Nucleic acid binder design. Structure first.
Ligand SMILES: [Zn+2]
Lengths: 176, 119, 187, 106, 19, 65, 72
RNA sequence: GUUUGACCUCAAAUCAGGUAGGAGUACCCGCUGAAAAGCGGAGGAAAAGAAACCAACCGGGAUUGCCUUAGUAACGGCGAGUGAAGCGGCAAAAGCUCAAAUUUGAAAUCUGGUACCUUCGGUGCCCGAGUUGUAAUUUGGAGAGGG
């Protein structure tokens, strides 16, 4: 398939053709709004490996942010704007000195293709409301820093959690 | 000395509307009688009668609307179930029982068996 | 309006700036009569529509329903091939006898390797003008690619001379100017 | 500050769970068939222990597939590795004894 | 043992299978 | 600056494909999934849920009058 | 007067020249509430009013949101 | 051909169907933050969760929580004091899905409308969506083609 070509070509960003397309598209998107709807993913392979499918119930927004993180704030903007949609994920496409550009995949839990088709029906659950608001996305888990490793220690929110471990005292019926 | 519900179920709608007109005239008379009267028990009966007439009329109208909308795969929202927030939403049974074809083949191939240990 | 303003300001900012030579291979494309005969070729090899498919299915199914199991014989379907991953998939065997490539795709990067890929695989590619004209011959809105592998014996001699025609008209004419940086002249 | 006043209560509730789950799982045990596995960490390396799951290769040596063995209630770990002989053999004997004592309904 | 024997007969009971 | 593109890698032509993927069976025989859809329609016609098209034209010829 | 009858809460705390209710926060869609004023939140929660819909909820939850009747 | 049409984009709909808001907020999750307050977002739990793990052993084996590790390691005008984690015992135990090579001998996929029917749906027909990829199969523990 052709996706391996797109990925390997995508890894060479400062190559002449990609910076050409980047330099055209940053001006072209600069013409448009801060937030708008893209007809199709400009980086389809990246959208696939983030989970995009080309059917009804998949909405692609393109979002502009000024230079929390920038990516998570970009997700929060389209989460606030299209509340009926659930945010699947997001990825970088383009940037300027003034703005970075992100391309965000959102999924509607109202469309019957999404309400059926059991690979994706889990996102219809109301526990998946506003994953970007709770940092439950990929960039949210990265900025929370949730993995396995000794490199991963008590960091910020978990720090208050282990402050909570220092703040509360546990007593049994029979004192130990 | 009052109306019955089941007696009003048999009647045509014009009979019910004329009965309503009769009860409203009777109410208008009983107000003129009651502005002289300290306590008139009949007006308390006839307002319940007006209420039952309105009940039967509205019920017949709603069931007629339901019968004309019976076949369609839709309904006016007021005629639908009320239940609550989000029991409207997020799943049907069919939309929850729905499973992929691969896990379907897996459960056909290896279902959870019934066994008894120490035998 | 805004969108008219942008779609007119587009293709100005492109040509004003230096395009890389892996682009502007596009619009160095096939001329009038050769694209015309290419379309006359591929309309001989239209794929089956969903209606025609379902119709033949109902015919043979009513045959088996009577039963009246007539025979078990059909040579093969021959048609154009149009799925992009399927088009790339027909290369690297190789199976693509001819490939048409649309010049206009908005994610151009979907397409840019295909001339070099058919160049190294030796596949007779040709850059066609307009993916809508590809979609018309393949019952889609757009197609952006058009591969063709299997040809009847009635058409095989026309195929080879069309290949030689394209390799004369495309590979000889535009090969050196393909290497050159296009555009760059202001508007 | 927190006091476990419910220590008496939760146990009762837990046994209610151990009742209620058992009601649904009426012939079968509540727990799966776990491996007998020797511990790490030289303080504990003489100690043997209950392990998570056996392996693919061991269940194949028992004479069945792990996909089927999960339906029989045998806990299976892919990411474990069998490196000791006697551990492997004792757990194979354990699997065989478990196979001897089950009766499976069609 | 008794109900063990009964379930052992039931699991030992061949189901009416179809070719 | 700018300079024309070097075609060092294109000019060597591969006489063989990349992958030694074995050819599947279904590329040579009539298509199976077609036939499964055929038998689906056969089961629907045996249940009469689908009318044969000759019978449909017979229906339309009478219904026009 | 400094304040006016609020259209939302009816408290006589709709300030005039600020065009706002100091009590409830009309016309802002979110209601004003302060956690330091926990006693103030106590005076205005659910349960103070009629709960015209909210009374009969859990009873329907006890009945499983049944429909119709059984004539017998 | 000054015509006609494919697209593509962008508008408009008292067009059809849906959905967002607010309240509460004990528990949860994010953001901000002093000498907590605040903000945002959920649920009956939430979060986390199936190793780019821990170890150095006769190795262990998703996550979660309890007891112990332990007031130890470590940190700290090494002052005030701050303050873990591996292992072990227990509770509970459950694992799975994508994205990469073609179905090319037939997009096999789905929304919607309509007609019926046994209606949390089914069947038929028709618009559409979709090859700039929807289905089946395959997630390394491999797997696929065949025989
Ligand atoms: Zn107010």
């Amino acid at each position: 398939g052709a996706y391996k070509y797109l990925e390997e070509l995508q890894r060479k960003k400062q190559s002449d053709v990609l910076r050409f397309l980047q330099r055209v598209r940053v001006w072209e998107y600069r013409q448009k709004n801060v937030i708008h709807r893209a007809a199709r993913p400009t980086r389809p392979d990246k959208a696939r490996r983030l989970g995009y499918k080309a059917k009804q119930g998949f909405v692609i927004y393109r979002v502009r942010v000024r230079r929390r993180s920038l990516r998570a704030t970009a997700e929060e903007r389209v989460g606030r704007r299209a509340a009926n949609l659930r945010v699947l994920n997001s990825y970088w496409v383009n940037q300027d000195s003034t703005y970075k550009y992100f391309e965000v995949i959102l999924v509607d839990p109202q469309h019957k293709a999404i309400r059926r088709d059991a690979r994706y029906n889990w996102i219809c659950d109301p526990v998946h409301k506003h994953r970007e608001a709770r940092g439950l996305t990929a960039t949210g888990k990265k900025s929370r820093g949730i993995n396995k490793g000794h490199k991963f220690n008590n960091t910020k929110a978990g720090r208050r959690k282990t402050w909570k471990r220092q703040n509360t005292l546990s007593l049994w019926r029979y004192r130990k | 000395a009052g109306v019955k519900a089941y007696e009003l179920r048999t009647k045509s709608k014009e009979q019910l509307a004329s009965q309503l007109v009769d009860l409203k005239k009777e109410l208008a008379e009983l107000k003129v009688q009651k502005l002289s009267r300290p306590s008139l028990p009949k007006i308390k009966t006839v307002r319940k009668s007006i209420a039952c007439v309105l009940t039967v009329i509205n019920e017949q109208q709603r069931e007629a609307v339901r019968q004309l909308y019976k076949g369609k795969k839709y309904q006016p929202k007021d005629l639908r179930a009320k239940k609550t927030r989000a029991l409207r939403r997020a799943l049907t049974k069919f939309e929850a029982s729905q499973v992929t074809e691969k896990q379907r083949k897996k459960q056909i191939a290896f279902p959870q068996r019934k066994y008894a240990i120490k035998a | 309006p805004e969108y008219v303003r942008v779609q007119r300001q587009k293709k100005i900012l492109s040509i004003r700036l230096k395009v890389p030579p892996t682009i502007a291979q596009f619009q160095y494309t096939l001329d009038r009569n050769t694209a015309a005969e290419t379309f006359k070729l591929f309309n001989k090899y239209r794929p089956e529509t969903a209606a025609e498919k379902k119709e033949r299915l109902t015919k043979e199914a009513a045959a088996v329903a009577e039963g009246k199991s007539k025979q078990d014989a059909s040579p093969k379907p021959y048609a154009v091939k149009y799925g992009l991953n399927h088009v790339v998939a027909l290369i690297e065997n190789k199976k693509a006898k001819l490939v048409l490539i649309a010049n206009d795709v908005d994610p151009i990067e979907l397409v840019v390797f295909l001339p070099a890929l058919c160049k190294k695989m030796g596949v007779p590619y040709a850059i066609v003008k307009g993916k809508a004209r590809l979609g018309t011959l393949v019952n889609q809105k757009t197609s952006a690619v058009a591969a063709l592998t299997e040809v009847r014996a009635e058409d095989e001699a026309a195929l080879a001379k069309l290949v030689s025609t394209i390799d004369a008209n495309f590979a000889d004419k535009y090969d050196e100017v393909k290497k050159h940086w296009g555009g760059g002249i202001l508007g | 500050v927190k006091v476990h006043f419910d220590q008496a209560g939760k146990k009762v509730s837990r046994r209610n769970a151990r009742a209620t789950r058992a009601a649904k799982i009426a012939p079968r045990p509540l727990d799966l068939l776990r491996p007998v596995v020797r511990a790490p960490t030289v303080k504990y390396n003489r100690k043997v222990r209950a392990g998570r799951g056996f392996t693919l290769a061991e269940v194949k040596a028992a004479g069945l597939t792990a996909a089927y063995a999960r339906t029989i209630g045998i806990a299976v770990d892919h990411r474990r590795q069998n490196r000791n002989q006697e551990i492997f053999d004792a757990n194979v004997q354990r699997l065989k004894e478990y196979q001897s004592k089950i009766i499976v309904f069609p | 043992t008794e109900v063990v024997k009964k379930l052992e007969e039931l699991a030992s009971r061949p189901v009416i299978r179809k070719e | 600056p700018y300079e024309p593109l070097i075609d060092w890698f294109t000019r060597h032509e591969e006489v063989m494909p990349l992958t030694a993927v074995p050819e599947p069976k279904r590329r040579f025989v009539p298509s199976k999934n077609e036939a499964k859809r055929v038998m689906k329609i056969v089961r629907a016609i045996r249940e009469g849920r689908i009318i044969p098209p000759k019978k449909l034209k017979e229906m339309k010829x009478x219904x026009x009058x | 007067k400094s304040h006016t009858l609020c259209n939302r809460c009816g408290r006589r705390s709709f300030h005039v020249q600020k065009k706002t209710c100091s009590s409830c926060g009309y016309p802002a869609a979110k209601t004003r509430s302060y956690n330091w004023g926990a006693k103030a939140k106590r005076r205005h929660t659910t349960g103070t009013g009629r709960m015209r819909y909210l009374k009969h909820v859990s009873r329907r939850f006890k009945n499983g949101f049944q429909t119709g009747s059984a004539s017998k």
